[PDB]
């Protein structure tokens, strides 16, 4: 099976224990470590923070002791803008100079492939995205030679349903795409004004459910139909939680909120909790367990917050090895508790080695 | 590490010439690009084209060879560039280069140049 | 196709002096930069490889930079002996080339 697990360069600058360089990582953890984000700058792959470059070594100095591992740097995010990724990959021009500005930049790095993180695709760049899938593999390929292995190309896609309709032509991405992260996470969110769970495996209780959509179960099996082999689908298990703040005194899945959760310490960001956050607001909480979405919630006071656990990640990888589905990719190692110390006991990344461990028993 | 170019003569134009590089004590490894560079007189370098040892059947030529230009590994020890259709143009000396492989690190680069073997191209 | 040109043509330099020479591509090549010497006569002798890394019993006088379409080599100390032609050549790969060397620049040293 494929662990795929992303790092987020941001992840440097949070206070105290929150500091995760690439370095921290265990270079055994993950089949594929996969590096956001990279720009791109005048039509050219180019580096997005300052020291992107003394971080990629840090990065692919782990193969070193573990030379089978694989890392790939992704290209875009959220603050690119689909507008801007959108005009690279329309242009025939920018697209050439771009796809034959990638393989350079990604060896002199030493990455062993691309990872396309178009967030998102419009409507009108579905062709585009399609186009611009075809070329970068095709010239993947018209590049190797005895020697340089060909790179690997993976694109990041949303498990929305909705963005899927619009976005993605899954069939026919799917033949040039080496392997697609499914983002089974993120479902439910402040703008509801409910309590949900953001990445539940099954709808579950058929009341509760806003949309028969919004869940990883539902997600996976619309891939498959819609073309994507089994083989190369890699489904997302997150490792943070959707927080948010009650409105009323109900504690429930559905229960009124005023918006998002308080922020936390480390991550700074309303409505997101790191696991190792999560370890620090589970004392004093009680926790829930969503029976028909088998992933747990806390509260705590006015906080609610629906997360993936050691139990609920391996419910998780069991229904991706059910489904021979190519593995699991984990947003995010950063997210994990990466220092082993905030969550108590005595070991690091507890929810991805927890998937490599379900991922790794029979 | 020894690498000398053989064959440089002189031709009529139209004709075609056979020349010959050889190899002396190359540390054993497969894994290296064995390539022909030309020099006319007084003139830039021009590379014409290489051919992967490990396989000996993975050949990489330059645009304006266009299929006159052959390279074919003939001994663990030479390989052979191929001229035909020659005319005075191709009057140059044809420099014989070696690879160290491909690496992430440090890519390909000629370590190991030839003296270097003449062409005349002259009725 | 990378397709490397190079500038100034010439350029004199005074004995013990500092020359810098300028090579670029049409496309990006990475660090996949090869600068070589090749005095009147003979084969070219590599000075470096990668953008900047230097070959085996080159002096440090000879040191490469740059990256991606722009690069350099920056000669120091100027030694009565460096006079010569000096060639760039991309190192990324032989797949759609058509030569993968520049124009070449001659060092005049004033003696």
């Known amino acids: 099976y494929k662990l795929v697990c992303y790092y987020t360069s941001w992840s440097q600058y949070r206070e105290g224990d929150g500091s995760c360089f690439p370095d921290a990582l265990d270079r055994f953890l993950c089949t594929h470590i996969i590096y956001s984000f990279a720009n791109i700058s005048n039509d050219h792959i180019d580096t997005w923070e300052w020291n992107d470059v003394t971080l990629y070594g840090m990065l692919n100095t782990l193969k070193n002791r573990n030379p089978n591992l694989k890392t790939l740097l992704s290209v875009g995010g959220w603050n690119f803008g689909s507008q801007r990724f959108s005009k690279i990959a329309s242009n025939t021009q920018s697209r050439r100079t771009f796809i034959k500005s990638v393989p350079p930049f990604l060896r002199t790095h030493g990455f062993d492939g691309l990872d396309l993180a178009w967030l998102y695709p419009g409507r009108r760049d579905k062709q585009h995205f399609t186009t611009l899938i075809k070329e970068m593999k095709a010239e993947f390929i018209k590049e190797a030679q005895p020697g340089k292995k060909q790179l690997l190309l993976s694109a990041a896609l949303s498990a929305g349903k909705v963005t899927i309709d619009s976005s993605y032509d899954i069939a026919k991405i799917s033949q040039h795409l080496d392997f697609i992260s499914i983002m089974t996470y993120d479902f439910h969110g402040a703008w509801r004004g409910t309590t949900g769970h953001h990445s539940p495996l099954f709808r579950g209780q058929e009341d509760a459910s806003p949309d028969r959509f919004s869940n990883t179960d539902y997600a996976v099996g619309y891939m498959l139909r819609l073309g994507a082999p089994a083989s190369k689908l890699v489904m997302g298990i997150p490792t943070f939680g959707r927080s948010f703040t009650l409105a009323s005194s109900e504690t429930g899945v559905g229960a009124p909120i005023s918006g998002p959760g308080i922020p936390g310490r480390f991550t700074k960001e309303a409505g997101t909790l790191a696991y190792y956050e999560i370890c620090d607001f589970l004392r004093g909480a009680t926790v829930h367990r969503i029976l028909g979405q088998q992933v747990p919630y806390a509260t705590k006071g006015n906080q609610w917050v629906g997360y993936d656990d050691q139990e609920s990640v391996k419910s998780k990888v069991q229904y991706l090895k059910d489904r021979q589905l190519a593995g699991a990719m984990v947003w995010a190692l950063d997210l994990d508790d990466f220092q082993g110390s905030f969550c108590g006991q005595d070991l690091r990344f507890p929810l991805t080695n927890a998937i490599k461990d379900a991922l790794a028993a029979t | 590490q020894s690498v000398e170019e053989s064959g440089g003569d002189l031709v009529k134009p139209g004709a075609s010439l056979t020349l010959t590089c050889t190899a002396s004590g190359f540390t054993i490894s497969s894994d290296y690009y064995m390539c022909w560079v030309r020099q006319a007189p007084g003139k830039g370098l021009e590379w014409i084209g290489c051919i992967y040892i490990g396989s000996g059947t993975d050949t990489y030529y330059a645009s304006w060879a266009k299929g006159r230009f052959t390279i074919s590994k003939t001994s663990s020890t030479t390989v052979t560039l191929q001229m035909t259709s020659l005319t005075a143009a191709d009057t140059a000396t044809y420099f014989c280069?070696?690879?160290?492989?491909?690496?992430?690190?440090?890519?390909?680069?000629?370590?190991?140049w030839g003296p270097g073997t003449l062409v005349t191209v002259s009725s | 196709d990378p397709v490397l040109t190079q500038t100034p043509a010439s350029v004199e330099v005074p004995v013990g002096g500092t020359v810098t020479i300028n090579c670029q591509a049409s496309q990006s090549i990475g660090k996949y930069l090869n600068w070589y010497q090749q005095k009147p006569g003979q084969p070219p002798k590599l000075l470096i490889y990668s953008s900047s890394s230097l070959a085996s019993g080159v002096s440090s006088r000879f040191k490469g930079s740059g990256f991606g379409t722009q690069f350099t080599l920056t000669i120091s100390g100027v030694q009565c002996a460096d006079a010569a032609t000096y060639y760039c050549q991309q190192g990324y790969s032989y797949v759609d080339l058509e030569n993968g060397f520049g124009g070449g620049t001659e060092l005049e040293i004033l003696g």
């Open positions: 280069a070696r690879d160290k492989g491909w690496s992430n690190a440090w890519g390909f680069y000629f370590q190991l």
